[PDB]
């Protein structure tokens, strides 16, 4: 036995001043191999559903995440690179191919890297003969944009529309990352100023904070249990007894 | 000058931002040692960052400043704790040998290049306070917890709350004061603690897992108190 | 219970992170390995209740 | 202590001819499964022995 949900809310902060990033391929000039941007904003609302066909967006390669479902994630930690390669071989920009460029240039520690577009352009880059993540600038010579996230507070979601709260009933939630079931109760304070989510020993959410009124919000779910089924005897007779068991 | 003292189990701050009920959390992140040889002073290294302890009677003391090479190289931090607000500024700064900081002066080394940023707030002060800088952002903790005694760094536990999160990527080797003062600089290492929550959700007690074997198997069993027998912790 | 909160190798130890950003062609590998390991912990437990 | 020359679908059965030779996040697919091999027949030997 279960209790179905009758509501799904969405609970995202007031902010929805946009990132700059419809025009970010568009400012200047992608940089080379000899620095890599990597101070970007991350106080905006991002939106990666903007332009898929007709850009200069070529690969769609990503890893950990779909492209599809992007409206509906908030991101604690943004980047975004813009360096030139050459178009002929970008299959070694990858979280797990060593060659070239992952001996002194590049290296991804297998994380969730976003997306990595190569794309096209004819319109130099100073390489030179790694830890993951350690430029160097250090003077032999011979003449892609990547958006690594850590989704493990949050102040850069997806566009979505929040609507209003809730409470005293089985209603599906989405306040940061959250999309479980669970019923909403005014009770148990205490919580600091810095801190926002809340555990227990065995490690489950059963606090969060509105981002928009700054309320301690308890997430129980729904009653549950067994249903036995006590029966006479289907030679002796036909009707039966429901037990529910713990509710 | 330069004197050697004992700690005497403090420098334990909040680890995440997760609220948690009276439970026993083993954690493993850059922390102070329980009983380490910390140095007394009346161009520090930074390593794996340093636990800044200093009394003052009237806030005498303030500001810092960290560094690489500092003139043109990797830029540098000043932190001015004014009477009103905190200014941070990281720019490129030069020359900078001594601090020597209406009577005082209000120029340290001056020489700015460029902009990265500029956070004010709410001022730190209004003894022993204490603070805690970790580097990768920049973490910075505080606690201000007025006691009585001569020497200070008293008995009982002191848990750091977190104040200033900012986020600049750069490595920073050589430590010093900005402005007759008193203050102590620990070393941070590597280690494992099992802090203890109470019921308003505050670090109340913690243990070391590597200074010693009753307090190597207080942490392998998650119990603060240990009953008669043998047990076998490690290899 | 402490067993739900483990990876097995996956990217996390709760359905509703990996049902939230993969795509229904790649969700299913790290699906697979957490319903491996939390049957490998059922059968231990019944085991050791026996 | 024979059981620990079993390839368990791997290329090899020692650690070092694999974290020298292979590739590093190549050889996670079989250090996986000698970790679960070997875990296996650890499981078993426990369980035989209760």
Redesign the interface.
Same mark, same amino acid.
């Given at each position: 036995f279960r209790v179905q949900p009758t509501e799904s809310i969405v609970r995202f902060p007031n902010i929805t001043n946009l990132c700059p990033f419809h025009e970010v391929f568009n400012a200047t000039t992608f940089a080379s191999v000899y620095a890599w941007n990597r101070k970007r904003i991350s106080n905006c609302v991002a939106d990666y559903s903007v332009i898929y066909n007709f850009a200069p967006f070529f690969a769609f390669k990503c890893y950990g995440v779909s492209p599809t479902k992007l409206n509906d994630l908030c991101f604690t930690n943004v980047y975004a690179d813009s360096f030139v390669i050459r178009g002929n071989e970008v299959s070694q920009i990858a979280p797990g191919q060593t060659g070239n460029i992952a001996d002194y240039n590049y290296k991804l520690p297998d994380d969730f890297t976003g997306c990595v577009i190569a794309w096209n352009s004819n319109k130099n880059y100073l390489y030179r003969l790694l830890k993951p993540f350690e430029r160097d600038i250090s003077t032999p010579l011979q003449s892609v944009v990547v958006l690594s996230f850590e989704l493990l507070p949050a102040t850069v979601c997806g566009p979505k529309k929040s609507t209003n709260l809730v409470k005293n009933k089985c209603v599906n939630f989405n306040f940061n990352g959250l999309t479980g079931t669970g019923v909403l109760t005014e009770s148990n304070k205490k919580f600091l100023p810095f801190q926002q989510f809340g555990r227990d020993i065995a490690d489950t959410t059963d606090a969060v904070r509105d981002p928009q009124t700054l309320e301690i919000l308890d997430i129980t779910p729904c009653s549950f249990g067994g249903v036995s089924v006590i029966t006479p005897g289907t030679n002796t007779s036909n009707q039966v007894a429901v037990l529910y068991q713990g509710v | 000058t330069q004197s050697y003292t004992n700690s005497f189990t403090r420098g334990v701050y909040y680890p995440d931002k997760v609220f948690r009920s009276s439970v026993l959390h083993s954690t493993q992140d850059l922390f102070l040692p329980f009983f380490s040889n910390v140095t007394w002073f009346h161009a520090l290294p930074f390593n794996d960052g340093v636990y800044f302890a200093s009394t003052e009677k009237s806030n005498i003391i303030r500001g810092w400043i960290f560094g690489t090479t500092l003139d043109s190289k990797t830029q540098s931090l000043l932190i001015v704790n004014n009477a009103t607000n905190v200014v941070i500024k990281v720019c490129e700064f030069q020359f900078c040998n001594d601090p020597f900081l209406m009577e005082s002066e209000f120029r340290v080394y001056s020489s700015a290049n460029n902009c990265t940023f500029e956070y004010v707030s709410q001022p730190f002060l209004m003894n022993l306070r204490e603070f805690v800088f970790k580097n990768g952002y920049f973490k910075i903790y505080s606690k201000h917890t007025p006691i009585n005694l001569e020497r200070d760094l008293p008995q009982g536990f002191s848990a750091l709350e977190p104040l200033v999160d900012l986020p600049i990527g750069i490595n920073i080797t050589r430590f010093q004061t900005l402005l007759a003062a008193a203050y102590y600089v620990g070393y941070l290492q590597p280690r494992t603690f099992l802090l203890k929550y109470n019921e308003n959700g505050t670090i109340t007690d913690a243990v070391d897992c590597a200074l010693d074997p009753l307090s190597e198997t207080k942490c392998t069993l998650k119990s603060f108190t240990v009953e008669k027998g043998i047990y076998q912790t490690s290899n | 219970?402490?067993q @739900?909160?483990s990876k097995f190798?996956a990217?996390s130890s709760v359905l509703? $992170?990996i @049902?939230?950003? @993969? $795509?229904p062609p790649?969700a299913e590998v790290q699906i697979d390995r957490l319903i491996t390991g939390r049957l490998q912990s059922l059968q231990?437990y019944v085991?050791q209740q026996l």
């Open positions: - | - | 219970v402490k @739900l909160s190798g990217i509703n $992170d @049902l939230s950003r @993969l $795509d790649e231990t085991t």
